[PDB]
């Protein structure tokens, strides 16, 4: 519904990325006790609906040392805490090890108002209809030189960024999260696409621009997964 | 307590930040076992109420690989050691992996006397009336260049730091610990706020100042939690 | 098979490198249950032989903390994900610990068209006949300075790279995968050789060229293995 | 072993061995753990003719670390045999090592070139004090440091000492030369009753030119309390 | 054995350094079962004595997190692979965890022919008659600047290295392995000495030469052990 779209598009909303890998002694547990422990997670995510939005991603076989990622949107990070903690306490959750936990807040754009009108218009496009796209998460930390630049300078650099990314507006969906102070990175970037070679070419195009020289850290980890319904993912651990 | 406030405010007091993560095989234990274990911790903290102040924070679901933090204040770090050792020797304690241990001493300010009188007055404000705030801990190591600067130059740079922070005095409470020689960092910074976006905006404001650029290390980890009664944390492990 | 050869030579094909370590408790099992565990993996590979190419490498005793690598070629990474996910859920797979996971795409060369005719001709040679060669996989990330260079400047630097490599065209087979955006590196370099000292001499030759100073990261890990049929490797694990 | 001699003579190896206890140690019966603690104490006593072993409680002060030994020996072979026997005890078998650093004591390289007043002041080295705090800071110098001539390093080390003078009484020091034996150049060791004095000393040294030649400083910085072995071990027998 | 000596002195021979740490759960095994396990390792080594040389070092109590190291010389790394894999599969081997695996090849010297004649003559002495010496292994990675220097310049720098090392030619035995491309380092240096203070003084003398400023990585780990018959090492684990 619009409640979901609200959380996904409005400013001041927190996005949290939580990554998990299943331990080995999980498969030592009797079979039917694992199909049952999966039901618990199914119901818990249903309960927290409304309050928060939980989307699920299969990282297993695409990201090293990771099976599952949640992307969680919440108006108060306190609620995300409470869900994750209840999730980690489920019998399925107890056998998971964390591979990452990052938070950021959505904000109204800082630079877009200073771009040419034709660019502002093009930025209205953001991905397409895609069922079960690939998703990529790339955390980013800027160098001190970036923050020492004044706004006019950073505006020009971000215009160059945007100019380079323009050909990819339809085939790559984006969402930027402002992370500074909530963990060790400044930004969390998130993308969906059906065409990974397009995403690859997009990043290559951005590598040339001046602002991609101000990234003190880029990735670590770069997470790649496929977006799916949660039951399909947990189904794999009950087999 | 006036004793509690003296420890939270006086100079010469040691602050310790002790982070723990719970073992997986804690959950392989029967519920009743885990039940008795939580009550013993409360009693321990009360046994030490005379010597030290212990405050508890839920990190689970907010900081990666961390479930619980204590902030401990004491006039002798021997006392903190004895508490934490006794704590780690409780039935609950026996199952925690340590995820961080940092110490520092409160000092009367080094630079503030050299600021303008208006700035000195503004600094009398330190945060808000806040139950269950978010807490953030950021360890900082300065570069060699910082220490090579003379006092006059560092004063000017810290006035700039302070100037940028002034708008956040009401909504972000701060406490600075001098750490050099007690672990691998120079400072432990501690913050409480009800408004995470304000804290994020405060750090962004400070990224711009010239003192920022003198941080050889900033975070790693950046700890994010919710300040809460211990019982509330303990209860999650009893489920 | 020509289709196999198509996957190994055509552009737009994804190469995935998946590394695994066998658990200490795998050898606890009777060779009987391991013999059938091995047959299960065989079955899965055959089942997937219509969509993907899977090749296997023994890393045990040559690469630290790794026993097995797969190199998988697919037209879609989602096919690779499903294969690796299924493989990790087999009884053998359940007793492996995932290690590294890297992906890249094959591309028609960017620079070769700008090289001298003699060099283009020489580049028609790539390895030679040899059974069960050694294999080496080296992930590489370029510095920002590399991407800020224009195409002409990079072409000249890649000419120098190729010039240093010419004596190794026949003794070392090469395959380059374009990785940016799919994990934390820009390229995955893959080599086969019967003569490890020749490979060592190749890398040394390359160390002198200016391009090799633009490597922000090189290796970590440098994977070294012996290429061989899956059956042989797996029956070494069965005994 | 003559204890004062090991602690003060040149050519003596000092070893810093750090250990954390496995969690499954606590699943052992109390009686088994009592016995195990006697085995460790007896082992130290059996080796007390050959090496000096001093014990420090890191639990609650250093992250991921419960126990440190500082061992002095005339030959690292003796230290090796002691630590290996220790690690084979019932208790030792449940410990994870969290550090192992070695260095030799040496006659001073720079002090002969300092002023006579500084040479005299350096005769003072710390503090009659029971159960002090101890700090261990591993240090690696940058390449530039070794490229300097001896005259230049002498002047820089005089500046170091000048800044440290006020603390000679409240902070005991012992410097070990470690290059080639592990990944660091020096192991620094300090004892104090007054951690704020140690803090202030390190701050005073951060300003000197020499402290800008440290490629690596700490990692880990070990903080502990010096204690009779029996008192440290009794914690584990609960 | 002349064949032992050929492996240790001839060019083109591979040296492998394999470090192991005994898991704690070994010690839960009854003493008798561990006695039988030691026996099995002894016979495996004897079986391989025809093709490779295996020497053993006690790292326990001298190198952090490490109990045992093998130095293996082989004419093909394939042989070393098969030995180490069979060793890791023995019951004793299944309770070891790897703390390092590096390979390098022996080469005829690159710079020696460019030194003065008297220096070439001095380099004829390598080490002493010394039973159960200390052994030190230091992996080294050069910076890009080293490889950018021409051969004449590197020759002069290596002459200065050799000049500083001259006093130690009798007291410290040396063996250099060329590792580039086989793992993440360029060289493995290996030393034997009866007097650790002489080795310390040797490294100190070299820290002053221009070449030692080109070491991007030096150690990590620096391995220190005592050379001894394998039986004695293994005995300790039988207790
Ligand atoms: C269709 C593709 C993309 C488009 C249209 C796009 C556009 C933009 C725009 C307009 C901004 C400025 C936001 C503001 O004004 O506050 C921005 C910021 C940013 N973008 Fe992108 N971008 C794209 C792809 C990427 C990629 C692939 C990455 C990195 C993996 C990336 C990393 C960032 C970062 C880190 C910022 C924040 C920089 C800052 O505000 O200081 N973007 N992007
Ligand atoms: C409302 C928020 C803040 C205010 C009013 C404030 C103000 C100050 C002041 C006045 C000092 C000087 C203390 C002295 O004279 O000894 C100081 C020191 C310091 N502050 Fe802040 N600050 C704020 C937020 C922060 C934040 C967010 C950080 C970093 C995360 C931070 C990091 C530091 C550090 C590392 C020092 C010690 C620098 C030194 O003494 O060398 N402060 N701060
Ligand atoms: C006989 C051996 C080799 C030959 C003939 C060779 C040749 C080439 C050529 C022609 C290209 C340019 C491809 C293009 O135009 O798109 C290239 C790219 C590349 N090569 Fe090699 N190479 C060899 C060995 C190696 C080795 C040993 C490494 C590193 C370990 C390596 C690393 C790379 C990298 C990272 C690139 C991509 C650079 C870029 O396109 O920006 N090559 N190589
Ligand atoms: C009361 C406090 C201190 C005094 C009196 C003092 C004095 C000295 C002296 C005289 C030397 C030169 C030894 C020689 O001539 O060979 C020295 C060396 C050294 N000190 Fe200190 N020091 C003190 C504290 C510290 C501290 C707190 C540290 C760092 C944590 C430190 C680190 C070092 C290092 C790394 C060296 C060896 C440098 C070299 O010889 O290349 N010192 N100290
Ligand atoms: C008796 C002591 C030593 C002597 C006589 C000695 C002598 C030499 C000589 C003659 C070479 C050149 C080999 C060639 O021409 O290819 C060399 C190379 C090398 N030595 Fe030493 N060395 C000694 C000790 C050390 C030590 C203690 C280290 C490091 C801990 C070390 C590290 C190296 C390295 C990394 C190289 C290879 C440098 C290169 O070829 O780029 N050496 N040494
Ligand atoms: C940028 N998104
Ligand atoms: C400033 N705290
Ligand atoms: C080059 N491949
Ligand atoms: C100085 N010690
Ligand atoms: C030098 N070896």
PDB file of C-alpha atoms in Angstrom, chain B:
ATOM      1  CA  UNK B   1      21.995  10.402  43.955  1.00  0.00           C
ATOM      2  CA  UNK B   2      24.493  13.246  44.517  1.00  0.00           C
ATOM      3  CA  UNK B   3      27.115  10.450  44.477  1.00  0.00           C
ATOM      4  CA  UNK B   4      25.901   9.355  41.032  1.00  0.00           C
ATOM      5  CA  UNK B   5      26.035  12.935  39.768  1.00  0.00           C
ATOM      6  CA  UNK B   6      29.498  13.544  41.237  1.00  0.00           C
ATOM      7  CA  UNK B   7      30.837  10.508  39.296  1.00  0.00           C
ATOM      8  CA  UNK B   8      29.072  11.675  36.093  1.00  0.00           C
ATOM      9  CA  UNK B   9      30.406  15.250  36.386  1.00  0.00           C
ATOM     10  CA  UNK B  10      33.617  15.459  38.460  1.00  0.00           C
ATOM     11  CA  UNK B  11      37.136  15.534  37.058  1.00  0.00           C
ATOM     12  CA  UNK B  12      39.583  12.690  37.800  1.00  0.00           C
ATOM     13  CA  UNK B  13      36.837  10.040  37.422  1.00  0.00           C
ATOM     14  CA  UNK B  14      37.559   7.027  35.224  1.00  0.00           C
ATOM     15  CA  UNK B  15      35.007   6.087  32.581  1.00  0.00           C
ATOM     16  CA  UNK B  16      35.099   2.560  31.185  1.00  0.00           C
ATOM     17  CA  UNK B  17      33.151   1.283  28.162  1.00  0.00           C
ATOM     18  CA  UNK B  18      32.809  -2.482  28.160  1.00  0.00           C
ATOM     19  CA  UNK B  19      31.071  -4.179  25.283  1.00  0.00           C
ATOM     20  CA  UNK B  20      29.936  -7.797  25.216  1.00  0.00           C
ATOM     21  CA  UNK B  21      28.371 -10.190  22.701  1.00  0.00           C
ATOM     22  CA  UNK B  22      26.495 -13.309  23.851  1.00  0.00           C
ATOM     23  CA  UNK B  23      27.664 -16.801  22.747  1.00  0.00           C
ATOM     24  CA  UNK B  24      25.443 -18.852  20.381  1.00  0.00           C
ATOM     25  CA  UNK B  25      25.475 -21.904  22.686  1.00  0.00           C
ATOM     26  CA  UNK B  26      23.823 -19.817  25.421  1.00  0.00           C
ATOM     27  CA  UNK B  27      20.558 -20.630  23.617  1.00  0.00           C
ATOM     28  CA  UNK B  28      21.282 -24.379  23.387  1.00  0.00           C
ATOM     29  CA  UNK B  29      20.755 -24.167  27.199  1.00  0.00           C
ATOM     30  CA  UNK B  30      17.315 -24.781  28.758  1.00  0.00           C
ATOM     31  CA  UNK B  31      15.132 -21.745  29.500  1.00  0.00           C
ATOM     32  CA  UNK B  32      15.141 -22.283  33.288  1.00  0.00           C
ATOM     33  CA  UNK B  33      18.951 -22.398  33.369  1.00  0.00           C
ATOM     34  CA  UNK B  34      19.119 -19.009  31.594  1.00  0.00           C
ATOM     35  CA  UNK B  35      16.382 -17.714  33.910  1.00  0.00           C
ATOM     36  CA  UNK B  36      18.422 -17.996  37.164  1.00  0.00           C
ATOM     37  CA  UNK B  37      21.490 -16.494  35.490  1.00  0.00           C
ATOM     38  CA  UNK B  38      20.000 -13.008  34.903  1.00  0.00           C
ATOM     39  CA  UNK B  39      19.058 -12.325  38.569  1.00  0.00           C
ATOM     40  CA  UNK B  40      22.638 -12.697  39.754  1.00  0.00           C
ATOM     41  CA  UNK B  41      23.812  -9.792  37.570  1.00  0.00           C
ATOM     42  CA  UNK B  42      21.365  -7.318  39.140  1.00  0.00           C
ATOM     43  CA  UNK B  43      22.618  -8.258  42.621  1.00  0.00           C
ATOM     44  CA  UNK B  44      26.239  -7.811  41.543  1.00  0.00           C
ATOM     45  CA  UNK B  45      25.603  -4.293  40.264  1.00  0.00           C
ATOM     46  CA  UNK B  46      23.883  -3.481  43.568  1.00  0.00           C
ATOM     47  CA  UNK B  47      26.836  -4.917  45.538  1.00  0.00           C
ATOM     48  CA  UNK B  48      29.034  -2.382  43.717  1.00  0.00           C
ATOM     49  CA  UNK B  49      26.595   0.563  43.982  1.00  0.00           C
ATOM     50  CA  UNK B  50      28.790   1.925  46.782  1.00  0.00           C
ATOM     51  CA  UNK B  51      32.036   2.179  44.844  1.00  0.00           C
ATOM     52  CA  UNK B  52      31.090   2.603  41.183  1.00  0.00           C
ATOM     53  CA  UNK B  53      28.307   3.670  38.803  1.00  0.00           C
ATOM     54  CA  UNK B  54      27.178   1.152  36.211  1.00  0.00           C
ATOM     55  CA  UNK B  55      24.863   2.154  33.398  1.00  0.00           C
ATOM     56  CA  UNK B  56      23.597  -0.333  30.816  1.00  0.00           C
ATOM     57  CA  UNK B  57      22.913  -0.045  27.101  1.00  0.00           C
ATOM     58  CA  UNK B  58      21.251  -2.370  24.624  1.00  0.00           C
ATOM     59  CA  UNK B  59      23.517  -2.660  21.578  1.00  0.00           C
ATOM     60  CA  UNK B  60      21.843  -5.779  20.168  1.00  0.00           C
ATOM     61  CA  UNK B  61      20.267  -4.938  16.810  1.00  0.00           C
ATOM     62  CA  UNK B  62      21.985  -1.557  16.606  1.00  0.00           C
ATOM     63  CA  UNK B  63      25.761  -2.177  16.796  1.00  0.00           C
ATOM     64  CA  UNK B  64      27.240  -5.075  14.754  1.00  0.00           C
ATOM     65  CA  UNK B  65      28.564  -8.004  16.853  1.00  0.00           C
ATOM     66  CA  UNK B  66      27.545  -6.365  20.150  1.00  0.00           C
ATOM     67  CA  UNK B  67      24.637  -7.056  22.483  1.00  0.00           C
ATOM     68  CA  UNK B  68      25.364  -5.136  25.671  1.00  0.00           C
ATOM     69  CA  UNK B  69      27.456  -2.212  26.837  1.00  0.00           C
ATOM     70  CA  UNK B  70      28.249  -1.019  30.333  1.00  0.00           C
ATOM     71  CA  UNK B  71      29.432   2.500  30.969  1.00  0.00           C
ATOM     72  CA  UNK B  72      31.179   2.365  34.321  1.00  0.00           C
ATOM     73  CA  UNK B  73      32.433   5.303  36.370  1.00  0.00           C
ATOM     74  CA  UNK B  74      34.894   4.838  39.210  1.00  0.00           C
ATOM     75  CA  UNK B  75      37.581   6.770  41.085  1.00  0.00           C
ATOM     76  CA  UNK B  76      39.930   3.752  40.836  1.00  0.00           C
ATOM     77  CA  UNK B  77      40.152   1.574  37.734  1.00  0.00           C
ATOM     78  CA  UNK B  78      41.079  -1.311  40.090  1.00  0.00           C
ATOM     79  CA  UNK B  79      37.447  -1.080  41.196  1.00  0.00           C
ATOM     80  CA  UNK B  80      36.156  -1.238  37.623  1.00  0.00           C
ATOM     81  CA  UNK B  81      38.452  -4.191  36.942  1.00  0.00           C
ATOM     82  CA  UNK B  82      37.142  -6.058  39.973  1.00  0.00           C
ATOM     83  CA  UNK B  83      33.549  -5.417  38.976  1.00  0.00           C
ATOM     84  CA  UNK B  84      34.021  -6.450  35.336  1.00  0.00           C
ATOM     85  CA  UNK B  85      36.028  -9.512  36.347  1.00  0.00           C
ATOM     86  CA  UNK B  86      33.361 -10.514  38.895  1.00  0.00           C
ATOM     87  CA  UNK B  87      30.739  -9.791  36.190  1.00  0.00           C
ATOM     88  CA  UNK B  88      32.505 -11.948  33.627  1.00  0.00           C
ATOM     89  CA  UNK B  89      32.580 -14.671  36.316  1.00  0.00           C
ATOM     90  CA  UNK B  90      28.775 -14.720  36.762  1.00  0.00           C
ATOM     91  CA  UNK B  91      26.799 -17.515  35.052  1.00  0.00           C
ATOM     92  CA  UNK B  92      25.691 -14.983  32.461  1.00  0.00           C
ATOM     93  CA  UNK B  93      29.204 -13.430  32.312  1.00  0.00           C
ATOM     94  CA  UNK B  94      30.782 -16.818  31.650  1.00  0.00           C
ATOM     95  CA  UNK B  95      28.946 -16.784  28.217  1.00  0.00           C
ATOM     96  CA  UNK B  96      29.834 -13.324  26.931  1.00  0.00           C
ATOM     97  CA  UNK B  97      32.533 -12.573  24.325  1.00  0.00           C
ATOM     98  CA  UNK B  98      34.167  -9.162  24.776  1.00  0.00           C
ATOM     99  CA  UNK B  99      33.714  -6.775  21.878  1.00  0.00           C
ATOM    100  CA  UNK B 100      35.564  -3.736  23.236  1.00  0.00           C
ATOM    101  CA  UNK B 101      37.102  -2.283  26.359  1.00  0.00           C
ATOM    102  CA  UNK B 102      38.026   1.386  26.574  1.00  0.00           C
ATOM    103  CA  UNK B 103      39.014   3.685  29.431  1.00  0.00           C
ATOM    104  CA  UNK B 104      39.475   7.367  29.987  1.00  0.00           C
ATOM    105  CA  UNK B 105      39.594  10.008  32.676  1.00  0.00           C
ATOM    106  CA  UNK B 106      37.456  13.140  32.895  1.00  0.00           C
ATOM    107  CA  UNK B 107      39.517  16.360  32.962  1.00  0.00           C
ATOM    108  CA  UNK B 108      38.678  20.013  33.408  1.00  0.00           C
ATOM    109  CA  UNK B 109      38.693  21.616  29.958  1.00  0.00           C
ATOM    110  CA  UNK B 110      42.030  22.568  28.358  1.00  0.00           C
ATOM    111  CA  UNK B 111      40.791  25.046  25.722  1.00  0.00           C
ATOM    112  CA  UNK B 112      37.559  26.570  27.011  1.00  0.00           C
ATOM    113  CA  UNK B 113      39.213  29.324  29.073  1.00  0.00           C
ATOM    114  CA  UNK B 114      40.544  30.757  25.789  1.00  0.00           C
ATOM    115  CA  UNK B 115      37.149  30.934  24.056  1.00  0.00           C
ATOM    116  CA  UNK B 116      34.995  34.110  23.969  1.00  0.00           C
ATOM    117  CA  UNK B 117      32.781  34.663  27.028  1.00  0.00           C
ATOM    118  CA  UNK B 118      29.608  34.140  24.984  1.00  0.00           C
ATOM    119  CA  UNK B 119      30.871  30.723  23.926  1.00  0.00           C
ATOM    120  CA  UNK B 120      31.799  29.833  27.520  1.00  0.00           C
ATOM    121  CA  UNK B 121      28.200  30.664  28.591  1.00  0.00           C
ATOM    122  CA  UNK B 122      26.574  28.669  25.752  1.00  0.00           C
ATOM    123  CA  UNK B 123      28.640  25.619  26.820  1.00  0.00           C
ATOM    124  CA  UNK B 124      26.786  25.552  30.175  1.00  0.00           C
ATOM    125  CA  UNK B 125      23.966  23.821  28.277  1.00  0.00           C
ATOM    126  CA  UNK B 126      24.608  20.082  27.921  1.00  0.00           C
ATOM    127  CA  UNK B 127      21.720  18.098  26.468  1.00  0.00           C
ATOM    128  CA  UNK B 128      18.109  17.498  27.366  1.00  0.00           C
ATOM    129  CA  UNK B 129      15.638  15.914  29.802  1.00  0.00           C
ATOM    130  CA  UNK B 130      15.784  12.413  28.282  1.00  0.00           C
ATOM    131  CA  UNK B 131      14.543   8.975  29.329  1.00  0.00           C
ATOM    132  CA  UNK B 132      15.928   6.062  27.295  1.00  0.00           C
ATOM    133  CA  UNK B 133      18.027   8.149  24.908  1.00  0.00           C
ATOM    134  CA  UNK B 134      20.115   6.692  22.140  1.00  0.00           C
ATOM    135  CA  UNK B 135      23.756   6.579  23.109  1.00  0.00           C
ATOM    136  CA  UNK B 136      26.688   6.789  20.706  1.00  0.00           C
ATOM    137  CA  UNK B 137      30.337   6.078  21.516  1.00  0.00           C
ATOM    138  CA  UNK B 138      33.120   7.176  19.132  1.00  0.00           C
ATOM    139  CA  UNK B 139      36.825   6.424  19.945  1.00  0.00           C
ATOM    140  CA  UNK B 140      39.229   8.936  18.433  1.00  0.00           C
ATOM    141  CA  UNK B 141      42.999   8.970  17.843  1.00  0.00           C
ATOM    142  CA  UNK B 142      44.644  12.242  16.759  1.00  0.00           C
ATOM    143  CA  UNK B 143      47.473  12.403  14.228  1.00  0.00           C
ATOM    144  CA  UNK B 144      51.041  13.373  15.147  1.00  0.00           C
ATOM    145  CA  UNK B 145      50.566  16.773  13.507  1.00  0.00           C
ATOM    146  CA  UNK B 146      47.880  17.682  16.077  1.00  0.00           C
ATOM    147  CA  UNK B 147      50.275  17.193  18.984  1.00  0.00           C
ATOM    148  CA  UNK B 148      53.007  19.157  17.117  1.00  0.00           C
ATOM    149  CA  UNK B 149      50.736  22.243  17.021  1.00  0.00           C
ATOM    150  CA  UNK B 150      51.138  24.660  19.907  1.00  0.00           C
ATOM    151  CA  UNK B 151      48.410  25.521  22.405  1.00  0.00           C
ATOM    152  CA  UNK B 152      47.345  28.762  20.748  1.00  0.00           C
ATOM    153  CA  UNK B 153      46.764  26.968  17.433  1.00  0.00           C
ATOM    154  CA  UNK B 154      44.903  24.032  19.015  1.00  0.00           C
ATOM    155  CA  UNK B 155      42.733  26.528  20.935  1.00  0.00           C
ATOM    156  CA  UNK B 156      41.705  28.258  17.704  1.00  0.00           C
ATOM    157  CA  UNK B 157      40.902  24.903  16.148  1.00  0.00           C
ATOM    158  CA  UNK B 158      38.830  23.763  19.157  1.00  0.00           C
ATOM    159  CA  UNK B 159      36.873  27.077  19.103  1.00  0.00           C
ATOM    160  CA  UNK B 160      35.959  26.225  15.518  1.00  0.00           C
ATOM    161  CA  UNK B 161      34.881  22.694  16.633  1.00  0.00           C
ATOM    162  CA  UNK B 162      32.751  24.313  19.393  1.00  0.00           C
ATOM    163  CA  UNK B 163      31.259  26.928  17.053  1.00  0.00           C
ATOM    164  CA  UNK B 164      30.029  24.249  14.636  1.00  0.00           C
ATOM    165  CA  UNK B 165      28.544  22.220  17.527  1.00  0.00           C
ATOM    166  CA  UNK B 166      26.662  25.128  19.209  1.00  0.00           C
ATOM    167  CA  UNK B 167      23.293  24.514  17.514  1.00  0.00           C
ATOM    168  CA  UNK B 168      23.244  20.924  18.952  1.00  0.00           C
ATOM    169  CA  UNK B 169      23.900  21.814  22.603  1.00  0.00           C
ATOM    170  CA  UNK B 170      20.254  21.301  23.582  1.00  0.00           C
ATOM    171  CA  UNK B 171      19.456  18.016  21.818  1.00  0.00           C
ATOM    172  CA  UNK B 172      22.781  16.150  22.137  1.00  0.00           C
ATOM    173  CA  UNK B 173      24.384  15.556  25.541  1.00  0.00           C
ATOM    174  CA  UNK B 174      28.167  15.065  25.488  1.00  0.00           C
ATOM    175  CA  UNK B 175      30.883  13.641  27.732  1.00  0.00           C
ATOM    176  CA  UNK B 176      34.586  13.535  26.835  1.00  0.00           C
ATOM    177  CA  UNK B 177      37.078  11.022  28.218  1.00  0.00           C
ATOM    178  CA  UNK B 178      40.855  11.389  28.025  1.00  0.00           C
ATOM    179  CA  UNK B 179      42.104   7.915  27.026  1.00  0.00           C
ATOM    180  CA  UNK B 180      45.737   8.197  25.877  1.00  0.00           C
ATOM    181  CA  UNK B 181      47.959   5.479  27.366  1.00  0.00           C
ATOM    182  CA  UNK B 182      45.107   3.346  28.714  1.00  0.00           C
ATOM    183  CA  UNK B 183      44.253   1.756  25.369  1.00  0.00           C
ATOM    184  CA  UNK B 184      44.934   2.478  21.662  1.00  0.00           C
ATOM    185  CA  UNK B 185      42.968   5.776  21.385  1.00  0.00           C
ATOM    186  CA  UNK B 186      43.351   9.340  22.643  1.00  0.00           C
ATOM    187  CA  UNK B 187      39.686  10.130  23.384  1.00  0.00           C
ATOM    188  CA  UNK B 188      36.429   8.406  24.025  1.00  0.00           C
ATOM    189  CA  UNK B 189      33.507  10.574  23.010  1.00  0.00           C
ATOM    190  CA  UNK B 190      30.059   9.779  24.444  1.00  0.00           C
ATOM    191  CA  UNK B 191      26.676  11.154  23.341  1.00  0.00           C
ATOM    192  CA  UNK B 192      23.018  10.831  24.320  1.00  0.00           C
ATOM    193  CA  UNK B 193      20.153  12.056  22.194  1.00  0.00           C
ATOM    194  CA  UNK B 194      16.481  11.436  21.551  1.00  0.00           C
ATOM    195  CA  UNK B 195      16.987  12.627  17.984  1.00  0.00           C
ATOM    196  CA  UNK B 196      19.414  10.588  15.907  1.00  0.00           C
ATOM    197  CA  UNK B 197      19.049  12.876  12.915  1.00  0.00           C
ATOM    198  CA  UNK B 198      20.254  15.801  15.057  1.00  0.00           C
ATOM    199  CA  UNK B 199      23.328  13.763  16.066  1.00  0.00           C
ATOM    200  CA  UNK B 200      23.992  12.858  12.417  1.00  0.00           C
ATOM    201  CA  UNK B 201      23.734  16.567  11.530  1.00  0.00           C
ATOM    202  CA  UNK B 202      26.121  17.455  14.387  1.00  0.00           C
ATOM    203  CA  UNK B 203      28.810  15.026  13.106  1.00  0.00           C
ATOM    204  CA  UNK B 204      28.339  16.383   9.560  1.00  0.00           C
ATOM    205  CA  UNK B 205      28.835  19.937  10.880  1.00  0.00           C
ATOM    206  CA  UNK B 206      32.082  18.877  12.570  1.00  0.00           C
ATOM    207  CA  UNK B 207      33.411  17.009   9.467  1.00  0.00           C
ATOM    208  CA  UNK B 208      33.840  20.419   7.879  1.00  0.00           C
ATOM    209  CA  UNK B 209      36.102  21.870  10.608  1.00  0.00           C
ATOM    210  CA  UNK B 210      39.917  21.679  10.365  1.00  0.00           C
ATOM    211  CA  UNK B 211      40.201  19.717  13.604  1.00  0.00           C
ATOM    212  CA  UNK B 212      38.311  16.777  11.931  1.00  0.00           C
ATOM    213  CA  UNK B 213      41.155  16.302   9.488  1.00  0.00           C
ATOM    214  CA  UNK B 214      43.515  15.607  12.399  1.00  0.00           C
ATOM    215  CA  UNK B 215      41.718  12.365  13.260  1.00  0.00           C
ATOM    216  CA  UNK B 216      43.997   9.499  12.387  1.00  0.00           C
ATOM    217  CA  UNK B 217      41.261   7.183  13.707  1.00  0.00           C
ATOM    218  CA  UNK B 218      37.581   7.909  14.176  1.00  0.00           C
ATOM    219  CA  UNK B 219      35.187   5.136  15.247  1.00  0.00           C
ATOM    220  CA  UNK B 220      36.094   1.467  14.612  1.00  0.00           C
ATOM    221  CA  UNK B 221      33.806   0.825  16.248  1.00  0.00           C
ATOM    222  CA  UNK B 222      31.165   3.540  16.305  1.00  0.00           C
ATOM    223  CA  UNK B 223      28.856   2.103  19.001  1.00  0.00           C
ATOM    224  CA  UNK B 224      25.145   2.803  18.801  1.00  0.00           C
ATOM    225  CA  UNK B 225      22.721   1.665  21.522  1.00  0.00           C
ATOM    226  CA  UNK B 226      19.707   2.507  23.604  1.00  0.00           C
ATOM    227  CA  UNK B 227      20.234   3.427  27.252  1.00  0.00           C
ATOM    228  CA  UNK B 228      17.927   1.175  29.306  1.00  0.00           C
ATOM    229  CA  UNK B 229      17.322  -0.545  32.631  1.00  0.00           C
ATOM    230  CA  UNK B 230      19.381  -3.749  32.847  1.00  0.00           C
ATOM    231  CA  UNK B 231      16.265  -5.890  33.446  1.00  0.00           C
ATOM    232  CA  UNK B 232      14.962  -4.902  30.012  1.00  0.00           C
ATOM    233  CA  UNK B 233      18.157  -6.238  28.363  1.00  0.00           C
ATOM    234  CA  UNK B 234      18.433  -9.311  30.584  1.00  0.00           C
ATOM    235  CA  UNK B 235      14.827 -10.243  29.820  1.00  0.00           C
ATOM    236  CA  UNK B 236      15.627 -10.847  26.098  1.00  0.00           C
ATOM    237  CA  UNK B 237      18.205 -13.508  27.032  1.00  0.00           C
ATOM    238  CA  UNK B 238      15.652 -15.173  29.363  1.00  0.00           C
ATOM    239  CA  UNK B 239      13.037 -15.786  26.589  1.00  0.00           C
TER     240      UNK B 239
END
